[PDB]
């Protein structure tokens, strides 16, 4: 048989991301003495757009303490920040939107974004548009902190891990229909080559497990296993269930 599309996706010839017009990798400030003990102030200069991304970014300028110079970080903007705003980042920072704090300092019930799975990760969770995590409780002994993620899962992580207050901007982006193939074309033009998607049923047997037949059908049971391997995993990888909910 042939090698199939998902197997070809791993080499990364024509499936690499399209990264020319991206403003830069969005990240939090590196964990330093200031963020660990007190706070530090920066100025948000520009609220800007990032190609291939629905959420906007913010350019935040901070003052290097060890040398006389300026350092520009690229944050993911939360809903409500504005140019000329002061962003306070650290342990002793106040509880306002856009500020960066550790999860142990804040109380439970608060809303944060761009959370680090571990301290020094510089942003892992709640980065897409309209997304947020909710702190539900702390455990100061054994220092840990329990959070709820956008998928609904509940996790426990270090209280020294950081996050930025508020909701990521750009919400509602998926409530608008596209109505046209051209808008999907231009959307994925800047993300990657995962569009259009031909159906495996419409191919020959060399090209897919689902291919073949005088009628467009699958010969079996679209729930594949998890111990399957590299050419068998067509659809519904490890389905605990199927059907409408």
């Amino acid at each position: 048989g042939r090698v199939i599309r998902n197997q070809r996706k791993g080499a990364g010839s024509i499936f690499t991301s399209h990264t020319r017009l991206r403003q830069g990798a969005a990240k939090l400030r590196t964990l330093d003495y200031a963020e660990r003990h007190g706070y530090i102030r920066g100025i948000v200069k520009q609220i800007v757009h990032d190609s291939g991304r629905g959420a906007p970014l913010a350019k935040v300028v901070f003052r290097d303490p060890y040398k006389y110079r300026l350092r520009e970080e690229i944050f993911i903007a939360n809903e409500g920040v504005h140019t000329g705003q002061f962003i306070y980042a650290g342990k002793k920072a106040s509880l306002n939107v856009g500020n960066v704090l550790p999860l142990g300092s804040v109380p439970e019930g608060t809303i944060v974004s761009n959370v680090e799975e571990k301290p020094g990760d510089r942003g892992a969770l709640a980065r897409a548009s309209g997304n947020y995590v909710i702190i539900i409780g702390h455990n100061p002994d054994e220092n840990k902190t329990r959070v709820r993620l956008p998928s609904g899962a509940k996790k426990v992580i270090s209280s020294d891990a950081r996050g930025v207050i508020g909701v990521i901007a750009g919400g509602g982006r998926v409530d608008k229909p596209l109505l046209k193939a051209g808008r999907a074309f231009h959307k994925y033009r800047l993300k990657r080559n995962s569009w259009p998607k031909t159906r495996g049923v419409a191919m020959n047997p060399v090209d897919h497990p689902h291919g073949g037949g005088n009628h467009q059908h699958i010969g079996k049971a679209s729930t594949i296993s998890r111990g399957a391997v590299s050419g068998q995993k067509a659809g519904l990888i490890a389905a605990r269930r199927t059907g409408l909910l």
Partner: protein, 431 residues
């Protein structure tokens, strides 16, 4: 996914089984719903009547409770608090209503109790008191005659679940405290003379076959069943002692008195005429196979057979094959002579057919293989007449009798039949 997670239980339980210190509020959010649901369930095509249902569509409340019961039964071990009364709620949901619950919910609770007993949350001593009372209630004849009562299916489910329970309990070592307790309920069911010992016999046979209840205490139960008045209980006992018999005969307390009581109660005593022929024959088989094996003496058997020993009678080849099985070396051969002379008068007489004569001779020679001095030389010769009979049934039959008496009493045979070694043995031993 977050808003749908409360609706998706299969993902919730896999998440809870990982980190159950989290997902406390997610569990309370469902336990409250389960409580509010059980608090509810606690309490035709004609032109006139309301339309009926197909039997497979259900309510959205029941479809939710059936899911919540499984979720709570699978995470009770993670949340021992807030679930301590859950199995008692299930138990008093079952054995106080029995009827305001749909069959799917009943089945779900019955399986959740079984897995809650597989895990050591619940004990067998309190699961038995849930399972047994439902059998008698769904074998009621008044509960099983609704519109869509699933009484037969429930009676099968509870039965196989009891079997799984006892198989579970008797794996490592035999839980005598449990077996001795649930044999007492079989005894106390067989007392109730209507039909309720069915669920004792049908269960003890299964456990004997699975080898879980090899004990002297159990064979007494089936003895009492065989000595019962109900036909489908007596038959269960008889077919147990049959299954050629099984090792249970070697755990009886008095086989002779057992056979005597059987022959007196069922067949001869009152002549109630309850059993049909197909059951009378199975009783005869048991009696004769006990008798021949254990050297018993009743002497009424051998006149009871004579009514039925006629070729114009229904399925006589089974009766006469049990006639021989009640013969010995140690019984008065006159009461068997009358039997042999009935058979000879009615099966190898004038004009009879080939199959009839062959059946007669074949069932006489296998009598004489146990009771050799039960027919005399004068009729022995009359029957070895039929050696060269041209029919190939009677010849094969007569040769068997000749070879039987060639090794046992060859002087009854004539010189023509003593085959080269019986005659030589007689010639040396006659001088």
């Amino acid at each position: 996914r977050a808003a749908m997670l409360p609706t998706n239980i299969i993902l919730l339980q896999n998440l809870v089984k990982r980190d159950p210190e989290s997902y406390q509020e997610e569990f309370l959010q469902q336990y409250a719903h389960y409580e509010s649901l059980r608090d509810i369930f606690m309490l035709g095509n004609g032109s006139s009547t309301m339309a009926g249902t197909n039997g497979t569509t259900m309510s959205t409340s029941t479809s939710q409770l059936i899911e919540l019961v499984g979720f709570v039964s699978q995470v009770c071990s993670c949340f021992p608090r807030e679930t301590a009364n859950f199995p008692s709620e299930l138990k008093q949901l079952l054995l106080e209503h029995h009827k305001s619950l749909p069959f799917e919910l009943k089945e779900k609770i019955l399986s959740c109790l079984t897995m809650l007993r597989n895990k050591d949350v619940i004990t067998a001593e309190e699961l038995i008191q849930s399972l047994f009372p439902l059998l008698v209630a769904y074998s009621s004849h008044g509960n099983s005659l609704g519109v869509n009562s699933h009484a037969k299916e429930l009676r099968k489910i509870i039965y196989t679940n009891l079997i799984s329970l006892l198989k579970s309990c008797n794996t490592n070592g035999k839980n005598q405290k449990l077996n001795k307790s649930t044999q007492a309920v079989c005894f106390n069911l067989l007392d109730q003379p209507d039909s309720q010992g069915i669920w004792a016999t049908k269960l003890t046979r299964e456990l004997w076959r699975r080898g879980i209840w090899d004990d002297s205490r159990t064979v007494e139960i089936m003895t009492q069943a065989a000595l019962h008045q109900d036909v489908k209980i007596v038959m269960s006992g008889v077919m147990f002692f049959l299954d050629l018999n099984f090792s249970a005969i070697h755990l009886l307390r008095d086989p002779q008195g057992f056979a005597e009581k059987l022959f007196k109660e069922h067949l001869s005593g009152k002549t109630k005429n309850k059993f049909d022929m197909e059951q009378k024959i199975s009783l005869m088989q048991l009696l004769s196979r006990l008798i021949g094996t254990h050297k018993l003496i009743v002497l009424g058997i051998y006149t009871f057979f004579l009514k039925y020993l006629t070729p114009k009678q229904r399925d006589v080849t089974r009766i006469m094959s049990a006639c021989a099985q009640a013969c010995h070396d140690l019984v008065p051969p006159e009461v068997i002579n009358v039997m042999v002379r009935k058979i000879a008068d009615e099966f190898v007489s004038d004009g009879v057919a080939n199959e009839v004569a062959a059946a007669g001779i074949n069932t006489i020679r296998e009598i004489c293989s146990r009771a050799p001095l039960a027919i005399d030389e004068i009729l022995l010769q009359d029957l070895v007449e039929y050696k060269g009979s041209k029919a190939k049934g009677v010849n094969m039959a007569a040769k068997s009798l000749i070879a039987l008496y060639r090794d046992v009493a060859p002087e009854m045979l004539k010189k023509k039949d003593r085959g080269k070694n019986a005659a030589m043995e007689v010639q040396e031993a006659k001088k």
